[PDB]
């Protein structure tokens, strides 16, 4: 069964998109220092998640 | 104290396989994050008078922690996809910290 190459583009660009959505939900690991002023939550948003 | 009990939780988790016990990974790489920014959060208490009691300081605690990083980041950055949800730092970055730890 094959191939349609339209099939593995757009496999990939969300794939990547999920790659930077999860640097940005999972963004406010590393930063991650005292006081700790740890100005946002590393998997913070469940409403907007 | 957090060198020590790092490269002896490598020692006691050196028996038997890669971590699928992940409570291993977490445990050494948070708990190691945990004292690492509990040992940065005290040495903001304390501003140096001596440019080289900073350059003192600074160059043993590096090189009391780095190469246990070095041989063990570098050992166990095989373990996810995304190790960046349980470890944090490089040692890229990690250096970087203890150089603006010396301000």
């Known amino acids: ?49 | 104290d957090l060198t020590a009990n790092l490269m002896d939780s490598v020692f006691i988790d050196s028996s038997g396989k890669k971590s699928k016990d992940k409570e291993q990974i977490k445990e050494k790489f948070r708990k190691f994050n945990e004292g690492f920014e509990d040992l940065v959060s005290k040495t903001k208490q304390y501003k140096l008078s001596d440019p080289s009691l900073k350059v003192t300081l600074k160059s043993e605690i590096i090189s009391l922690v780095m190469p246990m990083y070095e041989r063990f980041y570098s050992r166990y950055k095989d373990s996810f996809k995304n190790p960046r949800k349980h470890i944090k730092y490089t040692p890229d970055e990690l250096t970087t910290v203890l150089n603006q730890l010396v301000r």
Request: glycine share 4%; no cysteine; net charge negative.
């Open chain 1, 1 to 49: 069964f094959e191939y349609g190459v339209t099939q593995f583009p757009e496999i990939v660009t969300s794939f990547q998109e999920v790659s930077i959505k999860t640097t940005r939900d999972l963004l406010f690991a590393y930063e991650k220092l005292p006081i700790i002023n740890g100005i946002s939550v590393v998997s913070y948003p469940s409403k907007q998640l």
